[PDB]
Amino acid sequence: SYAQTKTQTKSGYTYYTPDYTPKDTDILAAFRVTPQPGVPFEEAAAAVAAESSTGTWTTVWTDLLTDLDRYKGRCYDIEPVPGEDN
Amino acid sequence: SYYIAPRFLDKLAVHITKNFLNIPGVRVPLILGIHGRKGEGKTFQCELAFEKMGIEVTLISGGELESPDAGDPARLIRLRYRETAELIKVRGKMCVLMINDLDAGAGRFDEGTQYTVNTQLVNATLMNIADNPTDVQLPGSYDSNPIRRVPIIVTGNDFSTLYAPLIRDGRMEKFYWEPNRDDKVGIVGGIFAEDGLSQREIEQLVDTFPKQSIDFFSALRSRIYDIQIRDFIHKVGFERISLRVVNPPEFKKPDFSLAHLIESGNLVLGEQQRVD
Amino acid sequence: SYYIAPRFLDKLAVHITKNFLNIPGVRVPLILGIHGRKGEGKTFQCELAFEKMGIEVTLISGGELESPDAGDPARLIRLRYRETAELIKVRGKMCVLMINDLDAGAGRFDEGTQYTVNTQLVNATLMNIADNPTDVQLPGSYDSNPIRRVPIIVTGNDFSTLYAPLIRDGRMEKFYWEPNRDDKVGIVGGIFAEDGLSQREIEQLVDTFPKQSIDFFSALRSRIYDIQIRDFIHKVGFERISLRVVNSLEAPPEFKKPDFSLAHLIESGNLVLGEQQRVD
Amino acid sequence: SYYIAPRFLDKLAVHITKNFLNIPGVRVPLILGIHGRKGEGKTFQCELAFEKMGIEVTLISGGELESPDAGDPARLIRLRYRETAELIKVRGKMCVLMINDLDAGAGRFDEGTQYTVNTQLVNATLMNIADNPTDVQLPGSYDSNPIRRVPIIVTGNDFSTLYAPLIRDGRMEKFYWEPNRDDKVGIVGGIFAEDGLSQREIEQLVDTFPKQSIDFFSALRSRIYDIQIRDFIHKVGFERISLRVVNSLEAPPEFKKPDFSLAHLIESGNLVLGEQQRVDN
Amino acid sequence: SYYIAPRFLDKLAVHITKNFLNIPGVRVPLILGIHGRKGEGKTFQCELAFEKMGIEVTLISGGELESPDAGDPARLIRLRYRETAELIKVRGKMCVLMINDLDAGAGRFDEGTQYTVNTQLVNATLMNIADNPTDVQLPGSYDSNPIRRVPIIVTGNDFSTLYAPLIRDGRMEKFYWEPNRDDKVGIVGGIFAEDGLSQREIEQLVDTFPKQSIDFFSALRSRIYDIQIRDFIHKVGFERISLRVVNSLEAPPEFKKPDFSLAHLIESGNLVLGEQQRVD
């Protein structure tokens, strides 16, 4: 085994985001969510944020003629309900 | 249908629970270390235990702790720990980080081998997490915001060849797993529970082959089943094997007899001796 | 109700104060390095000392002083020093940087291990910070505008495997820790203070296991609580133990104080020695 | 009140003066390098001399000579040179760029350690500057415009482990530092000047601990103040010692000069030695 | 008319059969992985076996999920798995999905030496399918109805360490396929069956190159027209070889069927050996 440290050169050139901070001019909503067995919590929350806003999982030629981040609802916080499963 | 040893389950349960309870005045070890002989079922019995309690597992493989990049094995541990801490916060249930086969990565056998910085760093990282479970940093800007405490389960073959401060009573709770006769009887009795063998018959099988690991018995079942399936494919024929499977007629059930389970096991030992 | 050893408290107190105070004609070391043996309570007695005084701690892990990027651990120390310096100006109280376990960071075990350049730079970065506590340059444009002086506390098992110019009188104040019998009695007595044992009984516990670190005695107490916890898991049931502990609308369980006697403690102590011998 | 050794003060003055002066015919080396053993007063005596002459310094750390982007530490050397060249034009005084501890940045310890491309380039970058101090080009647009000459002072522990063409008579003026008995007596005398010791007593202190750095003697003075400070911490109390020092709203406390005797100093010296020996074994 | 090795066929039979079979108390590995040297014919054997059995095959390129500008492997593997499951109902026959060069043909030098973001995704996707084969979910239009389980085959040079969990779990089976003398005779015999070579002749070819890849022997057939082309060039002449062939309306060049002898094959074999030797 031989490990090395490096310096490098660079060539250069979507619904659940917990990093986002809510704005003062935003509509906020609280949902009590119950998923089906075998579905993750973060997957279920991303599905609700998508289906209540724009949907659009597959990109079409019409979708590329507009901004995608501008008109999009996003989930920013998940909190568990005490004494309850899923 | 699989038998978990009551000793094994109680050691795991009490370790995880005590980490999650906040009993005042008591300091608890964050790492539980299971060690013993190879193929005794250290990993397998954990997976049964975690399924019973329904608790999420974050795995790190032992063949990942030595990379061609310096610090890359150390950075992964911190990254995976922070991911698991959030799952406790979000999913609102117990989550556990399990590092399997640590002996290969952080180990130090003979002096005839050439080691790197990574051996030094992997030992260093695990020490600091065990000291400050609430204060683990991601590279970049420092944040003084506390995170959820996550317990660590560590599997190995030997801990003698490991940095001395990482093995101390205050930092790691040690558990030596050597399955006894009563354990073996239960486990073997769990493998062949579906087949239909009496208690006395199960006892005899263990007595016949006492110097064997748990894997051996489970590997024996596969050998019995493979012969039967191979013959079925030949009898039906390759040309029309799909027609009589999609929609099993004329398929003799496997032998599964005490008399034969000895015979077949002797053949396996003879094959092992051939290489030896 | 933890006992902090007077020597350990005095040595740490004077080092921090003497940096923040200004006496003309006196030059003071920036780094304090505490070394000894495993489980004697270097890290732990520091934490009690920082909480008693009520001072902010910035923590750097020893297993973070090497990265796949070159000069990135060198950048890290220079960044964390500035960050701590700002907290003095804003909050208006003493702040301390702590690098726990330096030995395995910038240290060289044998003369056969392949090392990188990051090790070489981490030694040098701390050298320059200890020389000039006031002028630390964030990468990019230069600015000649002083920042506050911040003390650094360093823990290690061995300093013998470290760059030689970094360890010297003018750069690092050295302190070797090894608790005596009177220290042991005091600290172990502090652990079992709420339990209620006579002085003679405390002496006997130290005498029975004389060649033991402090961690050993604390580890005794963990083992005693097992029976109660095991019973609780059965009563609730293995199927839904997670729900009760982590996320439940009920008051967290209460455990009655187990019987603490010297005889029972020695029994448990011998059980821990047996477990250690199993690996040995 | 501190004593700068006349050898060290002359070697610094002559080098910095000669760079700013323009004598026709005489070629002068840009880089000055000072090397030797640890704790002998290489770094500290430079800072004193610059304070006595009243000249502006620009510090570059050794640990700042490596970055995750290739050829980026090369740029830093250039940019810090251009900046210091600007300060001459604006202020109208002598200015100096100092790269403290060069050995640990661009030095090759052994063949065991893997280095990067940056260690190569950094040695190269200084070689161009030492050849053409007037023409230093920052990457971007080429501009044919002269800049002022800035001398470079360099500290190090060992120059052996460093690219050989960077170390030659023509390109660097070399100065090895090792203080003698007279130098020791002078410096140690200056440290304890206010304390009040006889000449014979100062001689004895050097004789007791002959194989010792200058930092060893300075470390003694810190140890003597301990008792007064310890007592101050108790009187205030541990609970509020932080808000009684950092946020100085009233007046900082004062300490009377402790008893300074040769007998007490020797005792203190043995105690420092004891701590050094503890690490070794 | 190409020969298939009995061992290779057996390993495929048992895996496919057992997954489709519904025997209680029995656990079966979902994923089978085959590792060997390059040009061993692992891909060629798989395609042949399926034709004899008549079972439908879905092929996914290794470079199709390795390329940064391809799409999303996680979304792709899921989509291919569902589509294959639909075939069983509509087609009424067994359907298998296989992947070639999972860690290769990307263009990258490492070949699984260093992991990528894309490498992680395949591991993640595969592990989810192996645990819950009966139910597989897309981003939208979640269906409650279960899908028929589908066997997966994977071929490569070697398997990464990331897959070690699956193998220990026994969810993945690894088959190492290496050719033998008997296997060589079959494969070599099948290639040259149309040419017409004696059994003794076929044995000599394998004996000439005992330690050779399967691909080499196949490649020998190609260099039979070389003598004819070289001789043809001379009659036409170097001045105007291009013009007549490239863009001219004339009778296309005609070549008599090359004579097949053992001597010609040995001479050709030596030349390819020499070239490969010099390059490596």
Ligand SMILES: Nc1ncnc2c1ncn2[C@@H]1O[C@H](COP(=O)(O)OP(=O)(O)OP(O)(O)=S)[C@@H](O)[C@H]1O
């Ligand atoms: N309790 C069990 N019930 C049924 N089968 C078991 C049981 N325990 C082990 N086995 C079988 O035997 C194998 C045991 O090996 P592992 O699960 O890999 O643990 P391990 O080999 O003891 O851990 P290592 O190699 O020392 S780090 C498993 O793959 C199972 O097939």
Ligand SMILES: Nc1ncnc2c1ncn2[C@@H]1O[C@H](COP(=O)(O)OP(=O)(O)OP(O)(O)=S)[C@@H](O)[C@H]1O
């Ligand atoms: N003063 C104390 N009072 C009560 N318990 C203590 C005290 N000091 C140490 N301990 C216990 O002993 C353990 C000592 O751990 P550490 O602080 O890591 O000792 P250490 O010397 O820093 O260990 P190394 O060298 O980093 S391994 C702690 O987890 C405490 O439980």
Ligand SMILES: Nc1ncnc2c1ncn2[C@@H]1O[C@H](COP(=O)(O)OP(=O)(O)OP(O)(O)=S)[C@@H](O)[C@H]1O
């Ligand atoms: N000339 C002096 N007069 C009074 N005190 C001095 C004198 N020289 C050194 N000292 C003291 O001794 C210490 C020596 O530190 P340095 O000058 O950094 O030694 P050094 O040889 O330059 O270290 P390097 O080269 O960076 S490893 C100084 O911090 C002062 O406290």
Ligand SMILES: Nc1ncnc2c1ncn2[C@@H]1O[C@H](COP(=O)(O)OP(=O)(O)O)[C@@H](O)[C@H]1O
């Ligand atoms: N049984 C066989 N009969 C004929 N040609 C074969 C056979 N096995 C492999 N080949 C040859 O191997 C080549 C393709 O190799 P491939 O199947 O991709 O091997 P691998 O996957 O081991 O690299 C083709 O030239 C093909 O003709």
Ligand SMILES: [Mg+2]
């Ligand atoms: Mg510690």
Ligand SMILES: [Mg+2]
């Ligand atoms: Mg110095």
